[PDB]
Design a protein around this ligand. Sequence first.
Ligand SMILES: [Mg+2]
Ligand SMILES: [Mg+2]
Ligand SMILES: [Mg+2]
Ligand SMILES: [Mg+2]
Ligand SMILES: [Mg+2]
Ligand SMILES: [Mg+2]
Ligand SMILES: [Mg+2]
Ligand SMILES: [Mg+2]
Ligand SMILES: [Mg+2]
Ligand SMILES: [Mg+2]
Ligand SMILES: [Mg+2]
Ligand SMILES: [Mg+2]
Ligand SMILES: [Zn+2]
Lengths: 123, 175, 138, 36
Amino acid sequence: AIETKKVVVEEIASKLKESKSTIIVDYRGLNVSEVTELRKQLREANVEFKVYKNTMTRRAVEQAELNGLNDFLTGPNAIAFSTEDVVAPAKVLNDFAKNHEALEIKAGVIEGKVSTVEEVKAL
Amino acid sequence: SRVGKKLLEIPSDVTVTLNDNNTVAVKGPKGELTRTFHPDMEIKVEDNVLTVARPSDQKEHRALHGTTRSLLGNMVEGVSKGFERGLELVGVGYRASKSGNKLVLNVGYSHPVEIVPEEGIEIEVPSQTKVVVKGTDKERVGAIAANIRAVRSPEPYKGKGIRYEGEVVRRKEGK
Amino acid sequence: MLLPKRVKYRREHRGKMRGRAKGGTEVHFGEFGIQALEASWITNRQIEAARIAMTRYMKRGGKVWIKIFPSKPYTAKPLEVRMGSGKGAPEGWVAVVKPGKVLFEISGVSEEVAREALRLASHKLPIKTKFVKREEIG
Amino acid sequence: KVRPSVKPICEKCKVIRRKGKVMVICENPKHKQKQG
RNA sequence: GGCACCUCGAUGUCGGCUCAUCGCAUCCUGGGGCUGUAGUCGGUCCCAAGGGUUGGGCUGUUCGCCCAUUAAAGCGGUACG
RNA sequence: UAUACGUUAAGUGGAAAAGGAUGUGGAGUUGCUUAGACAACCAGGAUGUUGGCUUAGAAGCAGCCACCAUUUAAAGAGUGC
RNA sequence: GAGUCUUGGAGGUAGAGCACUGAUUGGACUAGGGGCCCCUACCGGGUUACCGAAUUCAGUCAAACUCCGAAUGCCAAUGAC
Ligand SMILES: [Mg+2]
Ligand SMILES: [Mg+2]
Ligand SMILES: [Mg+2]
Ligand SMILES: [Mg+2]
Ligand SMILES: [Mg+2]
Ligand SMILES: [Mg+2]
Ligand SMILES: [Mg+2]
Ligand SMILES: [Mg+2]
Ligand SMILES: [Mg+2]
Ligand SMILES: [Mg+2]
Ligand SMILES: [Mg+2]
Ligand SMILES: [Mg+2]
Ligand SMILES: [Zn+2]
């Protein structure tokens, strides 16, 4: 448990900037779909659209004790980091809908994350 | 982990009954079920809770302590709804039919083969190319389906005979 | 086929094989090798029979180091003969091995390859061996 | 395939014991074998 | 083949005949697993000793070759019974 | 049919070796791990991309570039069938 | 006469080692040339991947090899029991 200290102290600066974030389903992720969607994110902005999937709940509990006290109940749940570190997120909401409706990637248990104090219905 | 450490609920109509020498029985909406256990092992039940208290660790105690729990699980499941297993039948004309209570199968043999089940288990036939056994316990339907399958084992060169409801057989080539 | 060019005499007592190995009981010309846990008479064909396999399995990356050498000669009388009336005719050469002597050696290959090669060579010899690596302190 | 030395061939051969004997069972029945 | 412990005030050896009996490392019949087994025939391995296991030509012959059959024409011990 | 503590489950004891193996009793060395370990179940396992290459795609194992880096949550551009 | 304890001798076995006689493993140096070619035409040189006398580095053996070397056994001495 050495490098885990490193990553849990690194992600502070990562989570201390954004406003809006959204959650991705864990399973039913096609590497073909994964590369197409990550190249789509590539053609929009940088990799700031997180796909971090080494994300057991304890990094959440040791990272977001300051703000966003909701992920604890989504611990035993399909989790995949995806945040917004660029201009106001609406186009990412459109990509999310057109990726998550019925084709090759399921929404499932997705409910979004917090802007300042909110759970669902992002605009 | 271990399977002899999990928990087991008890539905409403399902009623277990403890007795001396650890010979638990069950009364349910589908029949009774009695099964004696090992005398040494301790069985203890609470409302919607099953417990198997194990004495000092040994080589055979860690085995019995899971065996009894698995058996109680199978028992409560069978008395709740029961088990079943179908039997696909490919043939090139191999067909089974019904006759009273027994079973008859016209496999490629030169005389009809008769199969009769014991009491407490029934053999239903939904169509002339499928057999489905139904019963309370699990070992009973298991043995009956095995004895029905062992009339005509599936030939590997081409699917021919009795086979389980969902299974893959290997295939060679003949010329 | 290994054998000495010249020798003093051509017949000789069979000797005895009690004790341990006087020397040669440490791998230093290489990295790995097989040790001897018992005492026997390694012949002249068993050595090359093991050597061909040991060098064929490997990819000639590392080179092998045979340490023993058939020196002592042994004889055998012709068949269907009574006892007595002289000593027999020389037949072949052998090599005396005592518990603890390092027989073969490999160096310049990896560890798993060396282990498997030495194991494949150990099945052609009449003794029970064990795999020993070079002393680390030197 | 009876032989006094049984050991898996492919990666998916298991090794079990029955009645005090050593058996190697697999899915490809060319590999099934029993010691002694 | 080796040795020379027993038998020199005596045991005489090979084939065939009459009669057999035992072992299994099974020739046939019985039950199985894998197969480079489509079927009919085969191969190799496992269990199995209950019964069965030929008539001639040549040679003193054991051995051996050949003819015609047979489900099969087993290998050995018993002072090479 | 003494006292005390252990070992063996084969009737080992109460006839053999090379070699084989999640039998069992010990003493160690040693990696990972309630930032969560192994199993099991729910996931996917190719993109300047099969790219320079070859009988036919060889598009994974005609068979030769260390047939490479990338998208990265991750891929040998194949572990085998 | 005998045993034992002190004291002194002769003698190269077990064991070890390479100081001599031989057998030998791998490196450095590999001399002087060896075959090929520049052409040894009449030089020298790249390899002789040297066949190899030297030496050296280390590493193994020996009933008819010793720079060494016991425990026993043997021969006496003056004292004691
Ligand atoms: Mg030395
Ligand atoms: Mg005599
Ligand atoms: Mg004598
Ligand atoms: Mg007598
Ligand atoms: Mg007489
Ligand atoms: Mg048999
Ligand atoms: Mg005539
Ligand atoms: Mg006779
Ligand atoms: Mg006899
Ligand atoms: Mg015994
Ligand atoms: Mg000596
Ligand atoms: Mg000497
Ligand atoms: Zn297999």
